[PDB]
Amino acid sequence: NQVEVLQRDPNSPLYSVKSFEELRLKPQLLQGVYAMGFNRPSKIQENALPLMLAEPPQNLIAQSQSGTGKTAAFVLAMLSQVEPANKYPQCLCLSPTYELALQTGKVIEQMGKFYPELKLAYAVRGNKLERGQKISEQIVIGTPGTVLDWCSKLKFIDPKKIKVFVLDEADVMIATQGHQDQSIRIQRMLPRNCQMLLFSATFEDSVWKFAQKVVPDPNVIKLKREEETLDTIKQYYVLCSSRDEKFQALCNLYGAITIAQAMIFCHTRKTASWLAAELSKEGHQVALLSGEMMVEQRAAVIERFREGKEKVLVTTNVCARGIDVEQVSVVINFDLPVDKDGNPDNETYLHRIGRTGRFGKRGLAVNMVDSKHSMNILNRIQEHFNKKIERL
RNA sequence: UUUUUU
Numbered sequence: 266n267q268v269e270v271l272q273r274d275p276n277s278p279l280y281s282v283k284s285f286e287e288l289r290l291k292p293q294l295l296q297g298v299y300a301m302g303f304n305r306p307s308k309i310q311e312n313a314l315p316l317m318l319a320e321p322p323q324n325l326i327a328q329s330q331s332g333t334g335k336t337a338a339f340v341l342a343m344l345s346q347v348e349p350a351n352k353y354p355q356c357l358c359l360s361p362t363y364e365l366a367l368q369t370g371k372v373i374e375q376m377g378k379f380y381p382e383l384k385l386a387y388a389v390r391g392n393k394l395e396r397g398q399k400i401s402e403q404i405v406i407g408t409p410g411t412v413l414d415w416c417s418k419l420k421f422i423d424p425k426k427i428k429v430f431v432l433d434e435a436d437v438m439i440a441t442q443g444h445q446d447q448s449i450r451i452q453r454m455l456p457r458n459c460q461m462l463l464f465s466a467t468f469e470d471s472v473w474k475f476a477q478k479v480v481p482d483p484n485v486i487k488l489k490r491e492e493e494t495l496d497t498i499k500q501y502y503v504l505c506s507s508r509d510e511k512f513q514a515l516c517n518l519y520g521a522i523t524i525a526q527a528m529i530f531c532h533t534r535k536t537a538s539w540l541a542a543e544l545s546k547e548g549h550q551v552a553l554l555s556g557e558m559m560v561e562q563r564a565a566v567i568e569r570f571r572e573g574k575e576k577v578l579v580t581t582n583v584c585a586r587g588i589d590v591e592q593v594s595v596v597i598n599f600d601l602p603v604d605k606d607g608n609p610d611n612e613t614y615l616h617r618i619g620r621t622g623r624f625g626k627r628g629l630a631v632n633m634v635d636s637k638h639s640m641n642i643l644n645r646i647q648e649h650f651n652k653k654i655e656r657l
Numbered sequence: 658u659u660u661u662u663u
């Protein structure tokens with residue numbers, strides 16, 4: 266409905282000149298697409314697919330806004346290249362976090378379901394295969410530690426047979442701060458002829474430069490600064506001078522933000538669990554998710570939040586990227602995003618608020634400012650994006 | 658700090 270109107274508007278990133286039929290996907294892939302409920306490509310899908318499906322295959326570094334369909338663009342490229350007759354990994358997709366790997370894997374299964382023979386392996390924590398076992402599935406989705414184990418020490422995968430390598434959230438996967446060391450070690454194991462696809466909603470300048478040097482001869486799709494922020498996510502702030510006041514303000518807002526699901530973002534695992542415990546003392550049911558939890562607990566909590574069994578997720582940056590829950594209508598930055606140094610983290614900011622307003626929905630983001638220093642950070646973020654954040 | 662392997 267909003268989607269139908271937006272896909273008719275040439276100013277929207279959801280608009281495509283061409284239909285799925287005109288993109289010339291394999292018929293089993295068009296089946297997967299229409300079964301997903303898709304009607305028309307978004308812009309990134311219609312722009313990236315021809316580059317990725319050109320023969321000979323081409324490398325791509327591409328940027329597109331939050332919630333514009335980057336996942337299906339890359340999944341389709343992986344699925345187009347696989348030969349379901351060869352029973353070994355041919356495609357490798359890396360994600361920065363456990364829940365994101367699980368989520369994407371689900372998309373792969375669903376879009377590839379009309380290739381009865383195609384099967385998916387999960388190279389994630391808690392996923393063990395006896396020694397001397399080589400993996401049979403043609404596609405692998407994983408997080409970097411495990412995949413890097415699977416490739417060499419344990420030898421479950423021959424990396425020299427991989428023909429498509431995908432980095433989702435490509436800028437944190439290759440950043441020195443992020444997963445650079447594991448990603449580049451995995452990459453070095455690939456054969457020369459392997460197609461490399463990097464997708465993100467953001468690339469800091471030096472990361473953009475670095476991607477051009479680790480990806481041979483890439484095509485590039487890059488946004489202008491003004492294009493990065495969505496008109497559909499309203500940005501506010503609340504001025505407060507203490508943790509307790511923020512919590513107070515949060516208590517104040519909680520009805521208005523709980524109409525539809527919310528995610529709340531904290532700087533540390535410890536603040537995350539403190540906040541979740543304090544909200545439960547007020548009689549609110551919230552679910553806590555952070556990387557100190559066991560994977561079985563992490564999996565069960567994200568699934569319950571997806572099922573609407575939990576309305577409020579209190580979390581760390583573990584959920585900042587890529588997590589797609591269509592009912593999330595509010596994002597709260599309880600803490601403002603800062604890098605390891607404590608400088609303002611523009612990229613994370615944009616990904617956190619991108620949890621809401623997915624694929625044509627509207628959303629709201631509320632920043633909790635607790636100091637002058639925090640206020641400095643907020644003004645910095647606003648200047649980076651040139652998008653004014655209203656006082657609430 | 659946040660993630661991230663057996």
Ligand SMILES: Nc1ncnc2c1ncn2[C@@H]1O[C@H](COP(=O)(O)OP(=O)(O)NP(=O)(O)O)[C@@H](O)[C@H]1O
Pocket residue numbers: 302303304305306307310329330331332333334335336337465466586587588589591619620623624
């Ligand atoms: N052509 C399409 N038509 C309708 N819905 C779509 C289409 N492509 C993707 N979607 C839905 O769009 C939502 C967001 O897609 P997703 O691929 O997660 O966004 P993304 O670009 O990866 N964003 P981020 O990972 O947050 O930078 C998902 O629920 C998709 O199922």
Ligand SMILES: [Mg+2]
Pocket residue numbers: 335336433587
């Ligand atoms: Mg994504």
